[PDB]
Amino acid sequence: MFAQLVAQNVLLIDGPLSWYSDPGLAGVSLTGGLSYKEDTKELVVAKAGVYYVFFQLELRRVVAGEGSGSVSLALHLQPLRSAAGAAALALTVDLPPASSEARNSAFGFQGRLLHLSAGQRLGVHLHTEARARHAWQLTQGATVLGLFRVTP
Amino acid sequence: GMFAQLVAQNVLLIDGPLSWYSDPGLAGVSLTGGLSYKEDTKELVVAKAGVYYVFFQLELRRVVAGEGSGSVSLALHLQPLAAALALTVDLPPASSEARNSAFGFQGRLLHLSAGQRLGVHLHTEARARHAWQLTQGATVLGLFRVT
Amino acid sequence: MFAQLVAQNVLLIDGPLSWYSDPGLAGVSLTGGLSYKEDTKELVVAKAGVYYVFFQLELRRVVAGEGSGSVSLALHLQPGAAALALTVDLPPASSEARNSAFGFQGRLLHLSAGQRLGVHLHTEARARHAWQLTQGATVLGLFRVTP
Amino acid sequence: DPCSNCPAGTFCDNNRNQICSPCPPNSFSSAQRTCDICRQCKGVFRTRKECSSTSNAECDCTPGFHCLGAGCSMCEQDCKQGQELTKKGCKDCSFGTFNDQKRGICRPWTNCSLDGKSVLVNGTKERDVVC
Amino acid sequence: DPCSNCPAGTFCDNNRNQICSPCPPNSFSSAGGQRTCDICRQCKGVFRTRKECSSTSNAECDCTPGFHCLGAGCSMCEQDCKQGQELTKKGCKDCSFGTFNDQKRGICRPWTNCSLDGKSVNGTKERDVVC
Amino acid sequence: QDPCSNCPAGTFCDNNRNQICSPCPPNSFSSAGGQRTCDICRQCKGVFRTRKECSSTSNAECDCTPGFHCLGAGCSMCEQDCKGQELTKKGCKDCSFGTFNDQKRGICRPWTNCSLDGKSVLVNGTKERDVC
């Protein structure tokens, strides 16, 4: 009972990430009672329990000598168990400012245990503090949401 | 199963061991199996021995705009007896590009003994330690058995 | 069915990392159908399935006031895309001590039967001699998820 | 649903079979399978509203600083002589404008030509023209 | 093994018992024996598509006009070189000492030596010497 | 009370081969008894030279290659020999006000006071130089 999706998105655009769900694709894997709703952009968990949920976010500078700021993932649970606006899992990655030394990429990983309800719909939202957001893109095949069950 | 996840109570960056929320009626917190938190010693106590994937997470937030820099460190120490798990997070110095937060995650497999007491210690190179706080509900110690 | 190896290497030298595999060593643990080939520097998985594979990379400044750039791990599967990859910035010496640098990544990998995983180090040197891998800290680990 | 039956100030305790247990100490629910942790207002934050089991606490800044961003996400020290408080924080007074006192607003320089007189000292970011 | 039998444009589908299923939309495999197809490259933002993605091979990107490719496989784009610069393998580096470039997308010519020409003189990275 | 406690330094309580006191494998040590595993031996490479070799009793210890000097506990890192500077616990810090150092690998002497000697200054002192 585990899943791993690969974000389709490449441009840094505020709003929810779309995901590759077909397990014939490299990196992607769905099993058990886990499923992706293409319309709502949500992973749907059938069997309840506690899961180790993790997401990964790699970014690449695509316009040499330009682009700075920050990019953020946020995992939101629908329906809202909290019923406030609080993210279940959250990550922020600094985009370094194009120095002579120059680092042209940026990683970020987080994971933790989440008690998930039956029929819980997990979705991920991208937000970005743009100072030339066009100069950076999501590294393709690298932005990943994954989980696996710990409770039997 | 046999797993735990605690949520640090602390908000001010103060050298010394972190206190933890252990009541699983709290959001984020979960204890199961032979795992327990000793409120007096500030220690997680593992009953059944084995190998566990142990991970901790540390988010920080700038609370005084335009101020604060340096570094903050977690260290997992095992009693009875150098750190089993360790993490350091740089606090960026407040620039035009205002980066007002800082994450840090580490995890690995640890062979734990029966009745092992895990505790986490915070250390901080303060240059205006008052300007930064632990982000609430974000600093987390967790583990689950692999054996 | 899990493993955790500890890199032997200390000097930052482009090319594949050698690993401690003897579980009498602290940190190291092999179980099940998992084994290390000392000649090829490869971890070898017997039973197929899906595993959570993670690696960790800590670095330490060894020449005070010197050294900058970047260091990268890459997990390659035998039999040009890396399965797992990590890069860690080495901060440039300044007033802030900043003598160390961590980096963790993990994800689920579907592994084949008899798959040989190997890890490759690459480094953008600006005084590569001023930094070393922190000993006992650079770690490759995995555990099976599929029954 | 069993849990929907439970109101605010409680949670649907899945360890003790769906029963509406009250929120434990330092926690709340304003609408849940668990209660959320109560906010702490420490350091540069003072508590504005205390944490009930209904709603979360809310912070204000200690005096000498002022709130910034939504929900008072962070504090900023009160704006110095030549500066003015904006949504984005203390920005400096623009050209042609000034601020005499602390925690003030950017008024424009008195034009002495329009008033009849002439300048005996020119204007600046922290001072009006003298005429 | 069974999977080795499957050619390029397909994968060894382990969910549907080793059968050589074709690569799904937006994916490819340029070798045989693969247990999954790889995701097709996207050329968006500053990237334009040079070659479209088949099920045999991956797509390839070029830069939109006003920029030019840099590094292997057009890994990133760089804006076309300004007044005092010349385009190299490593990017727009500035003209060296004794050389200059007048126009955009140009080459570093050397300063006219007026001593060698008879006359007398200074130059710069973006302008020839006047004599 | 415990099987493993019986095993001395230089060995470990091998839980794979039923509690037997196996010797520490290559490149490892244990300077106390009762350990379930041996610790990895330190490596002294790059700017580090080996001062003491790694036994199965104790860990190795490093010194710096010449031209540098140790710094912090266990020679945690090296630092290039001090130029107006003086070597402290915290590293080569500059000579304080009123003090100077002429030569490399030296000590911060104080400026010669010409008033106390009778004469008067024709040029003041500095961090790297003492003239009257």
Ligand SMILES: *[C@@H]1O[C@H](CO)[C@@H](O)[C@H](O)[C@H]1NC(C)=O
């Ligand atoms: C022009 O600049 C160069 C700089 O190297 C200098 O050597 C040369 O003498 C200058 N021309 C004159 C007339 O001084």
